[PDB]
CSV table of C-alpha atoms in Angstrom, one decimal:
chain,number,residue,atom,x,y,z
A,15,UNK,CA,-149.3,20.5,-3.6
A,16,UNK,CA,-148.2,24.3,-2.4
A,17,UNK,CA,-148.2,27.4,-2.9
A,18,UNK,CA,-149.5,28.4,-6.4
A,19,UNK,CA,-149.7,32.4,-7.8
A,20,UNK,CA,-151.3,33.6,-11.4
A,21,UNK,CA,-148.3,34.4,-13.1
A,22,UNK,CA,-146.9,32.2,-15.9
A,23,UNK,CA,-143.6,32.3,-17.3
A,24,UNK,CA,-142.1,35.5,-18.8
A,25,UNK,CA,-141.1,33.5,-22.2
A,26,UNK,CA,-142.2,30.8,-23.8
A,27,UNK,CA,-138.5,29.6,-24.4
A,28,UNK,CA,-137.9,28.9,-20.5
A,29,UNK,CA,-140.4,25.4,-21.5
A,30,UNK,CA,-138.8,22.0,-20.7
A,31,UNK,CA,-141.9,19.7,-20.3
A,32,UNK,CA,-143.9,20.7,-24.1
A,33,UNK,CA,-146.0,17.8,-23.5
A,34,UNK,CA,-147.5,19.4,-20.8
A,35,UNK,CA,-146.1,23.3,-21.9
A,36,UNK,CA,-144.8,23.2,-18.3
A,37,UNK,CA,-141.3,24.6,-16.6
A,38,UNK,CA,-140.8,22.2,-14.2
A,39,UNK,CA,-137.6,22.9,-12.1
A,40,UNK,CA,-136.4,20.5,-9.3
A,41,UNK,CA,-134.4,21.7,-6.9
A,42,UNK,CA,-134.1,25.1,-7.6
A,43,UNK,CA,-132.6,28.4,-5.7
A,44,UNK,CA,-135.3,31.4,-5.6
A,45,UNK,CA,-134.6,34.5,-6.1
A,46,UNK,CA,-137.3,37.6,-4.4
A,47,UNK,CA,-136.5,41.0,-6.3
A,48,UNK,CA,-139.1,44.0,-5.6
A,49,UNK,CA,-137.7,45.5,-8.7
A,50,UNK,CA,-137.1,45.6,-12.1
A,51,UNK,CA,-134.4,43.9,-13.9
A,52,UNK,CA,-133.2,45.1,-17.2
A,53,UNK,CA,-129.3,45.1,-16.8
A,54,UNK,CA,-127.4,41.5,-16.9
A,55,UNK,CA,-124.5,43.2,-14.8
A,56,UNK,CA,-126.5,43.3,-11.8
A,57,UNK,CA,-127.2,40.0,-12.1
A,58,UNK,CA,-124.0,38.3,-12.4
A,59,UNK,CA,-123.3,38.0,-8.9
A,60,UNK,CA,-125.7,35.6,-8.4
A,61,UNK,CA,-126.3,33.9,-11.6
A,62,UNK,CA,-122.2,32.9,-10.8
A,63,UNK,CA,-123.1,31.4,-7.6
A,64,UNK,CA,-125.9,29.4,-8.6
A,65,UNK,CA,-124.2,28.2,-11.7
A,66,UNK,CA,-121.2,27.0,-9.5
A,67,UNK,CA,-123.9,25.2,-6.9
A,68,UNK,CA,-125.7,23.3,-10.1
A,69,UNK,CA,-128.9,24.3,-9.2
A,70,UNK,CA,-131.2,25.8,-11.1
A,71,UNK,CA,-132.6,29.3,-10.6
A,72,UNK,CA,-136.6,30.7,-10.4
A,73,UNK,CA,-136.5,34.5,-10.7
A,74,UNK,CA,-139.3,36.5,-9.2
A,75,UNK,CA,-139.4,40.0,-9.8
A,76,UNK,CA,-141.7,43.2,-10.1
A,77,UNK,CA,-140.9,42.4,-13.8
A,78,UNK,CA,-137.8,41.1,-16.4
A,79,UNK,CA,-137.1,42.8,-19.1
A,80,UNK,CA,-135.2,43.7,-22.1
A,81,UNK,CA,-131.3,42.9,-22.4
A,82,UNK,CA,-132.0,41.0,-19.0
A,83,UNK,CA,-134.2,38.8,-20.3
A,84,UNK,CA,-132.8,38.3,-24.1
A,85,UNK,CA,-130.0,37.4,-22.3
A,86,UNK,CA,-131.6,35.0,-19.7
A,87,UNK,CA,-133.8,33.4,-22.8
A,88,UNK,CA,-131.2,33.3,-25.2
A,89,UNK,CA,-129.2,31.3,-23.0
A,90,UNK,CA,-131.6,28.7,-21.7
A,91,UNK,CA,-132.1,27.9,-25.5
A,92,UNK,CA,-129.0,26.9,-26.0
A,93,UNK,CA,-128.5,25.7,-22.8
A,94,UNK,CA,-125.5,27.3,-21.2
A,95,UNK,CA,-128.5,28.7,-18.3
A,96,UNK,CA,-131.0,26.9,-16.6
A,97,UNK,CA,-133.3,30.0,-15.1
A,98,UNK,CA,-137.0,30.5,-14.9
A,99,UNK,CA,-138.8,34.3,-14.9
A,100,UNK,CA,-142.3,35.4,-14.0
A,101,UNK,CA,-143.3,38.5,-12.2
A,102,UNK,CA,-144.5,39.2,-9.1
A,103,UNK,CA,-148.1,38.2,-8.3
A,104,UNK,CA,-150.6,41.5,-6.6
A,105,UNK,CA,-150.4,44.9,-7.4
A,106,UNK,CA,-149.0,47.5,-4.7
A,107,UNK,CA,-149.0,47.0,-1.0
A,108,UNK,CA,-150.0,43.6,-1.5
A,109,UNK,CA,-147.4,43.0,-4.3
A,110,UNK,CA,-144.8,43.6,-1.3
A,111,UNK,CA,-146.6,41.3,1.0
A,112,UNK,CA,-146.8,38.6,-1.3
A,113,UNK,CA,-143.5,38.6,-2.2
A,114,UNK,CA,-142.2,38.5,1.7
A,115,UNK,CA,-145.1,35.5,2.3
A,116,UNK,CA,-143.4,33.5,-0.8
A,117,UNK,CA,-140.4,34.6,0.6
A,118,UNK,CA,-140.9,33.0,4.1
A,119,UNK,CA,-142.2,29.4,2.4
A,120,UNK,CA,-139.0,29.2,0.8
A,121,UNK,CA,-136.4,30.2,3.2
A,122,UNK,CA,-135.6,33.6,1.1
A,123,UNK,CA,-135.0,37.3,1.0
A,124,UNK,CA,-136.7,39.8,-0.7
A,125,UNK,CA,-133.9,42.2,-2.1
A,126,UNK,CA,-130.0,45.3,0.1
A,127,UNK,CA,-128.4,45.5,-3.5
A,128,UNK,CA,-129.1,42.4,-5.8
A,129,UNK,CA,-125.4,42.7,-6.9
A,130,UNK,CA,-124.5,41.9,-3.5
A,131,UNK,CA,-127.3,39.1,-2.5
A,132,UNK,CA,-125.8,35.6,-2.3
A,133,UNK,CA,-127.3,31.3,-2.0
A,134,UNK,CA,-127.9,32.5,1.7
A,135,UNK,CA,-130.1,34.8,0.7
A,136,UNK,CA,-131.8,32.9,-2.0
A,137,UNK,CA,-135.1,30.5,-1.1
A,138,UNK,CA,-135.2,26.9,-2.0
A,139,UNK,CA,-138.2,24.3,-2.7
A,140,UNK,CA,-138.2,21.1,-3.8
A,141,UNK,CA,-140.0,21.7,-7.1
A,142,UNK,CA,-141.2,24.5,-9.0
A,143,UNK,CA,-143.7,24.3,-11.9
A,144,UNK,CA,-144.4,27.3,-14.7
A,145,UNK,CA,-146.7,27.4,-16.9
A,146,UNK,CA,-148.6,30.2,-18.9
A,147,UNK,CA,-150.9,31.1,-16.1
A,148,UNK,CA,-149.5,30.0,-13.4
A,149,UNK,CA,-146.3,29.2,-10.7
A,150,UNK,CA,-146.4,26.5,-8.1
A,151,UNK,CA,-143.9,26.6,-5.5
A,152,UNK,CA,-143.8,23.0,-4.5
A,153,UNK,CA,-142.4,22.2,-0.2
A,154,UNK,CA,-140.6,24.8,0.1
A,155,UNK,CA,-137.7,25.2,2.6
C-alpha cells in the first residue's frame, strides 16, 4: 500500500490494465507542477529526458489541458509516449501543501521554470496506479 489521493486519470486513453480500467506504471519519474499546462513546448525538456532514461512519466499538475494533453493522449495511443496525467488533489492552501507532502514521498520538486526542471528534480516510486477516481503512489523514493 501508499499514498493514495481522489483524482483519477485525466483521459481515459492513458489505460493499460482494461481488465481492471487501471494505469498502472512501474517504475515511473514524477513530475510536481503547481500550474497549468497547456503548451507542449514547455514540456519538452523533460519529456526528452525521461524518454532517453526509459522510464515512464506520472504528471501531477494544478490541471492538463488542451494541445498539452491532445498531444500527451494522442501519443500514448499510438505508443510513441508512455505518460500518465491527473490533477492536483485539495483546493488552495492545501492544494500547495499536498503537492509538497507527495512531493517529499517521492523524492521530488514541486516546480523554478518547468522548461528548465530535470530527472534530479523529478520524484520516483516503485509503482503508480490510476484509475477513474483515484492515484496510488506506491513506496516511493
Amino acid at each position: 500500500e501508499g499514498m493514495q489521493f481522489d483524482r483519477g486519470y485525466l483521459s481515459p486513453y492513458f489505460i493499460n490494465k482494461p481488465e481492471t480500467g487501471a494505469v498502472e506504471l512501474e517504475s515511473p519519474f514524477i513530475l510536481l507542477a503547481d500550474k497549468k499546462i497547456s503548451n507542449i513546448r514547455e514540456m519538452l525538456p523533460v519529456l526528452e529526458a525521461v524518454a532517453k532514461a526509459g522510464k515512464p512519466l506520472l504528471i501531477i499538475a494544478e490541471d492538463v489541458e488542451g494541445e498539452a494533453l491532445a498531444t500527451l493522449v494522442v501519443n500514448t495511443m499510438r505508443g510513441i509516449v508512455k505518460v500518465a496525467a491527473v490533477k492536483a488533489p485539495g483546493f488552495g492552501d492545501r492544494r500547495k501543501a499536498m503537492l509538497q507532502d507527495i512531493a517529499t514521498l517521492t523524492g521530488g520538486t514541486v516546480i523554478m521554470e518547468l522548461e528548465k526542471a530535470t530527472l534530479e528534480d523529478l520524484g520516483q516510486a516503485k509503482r503508480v496506479v490510476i484509475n477513474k477516481d483515484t492515484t496510488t503512489i506506491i513506496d516511493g523514493v
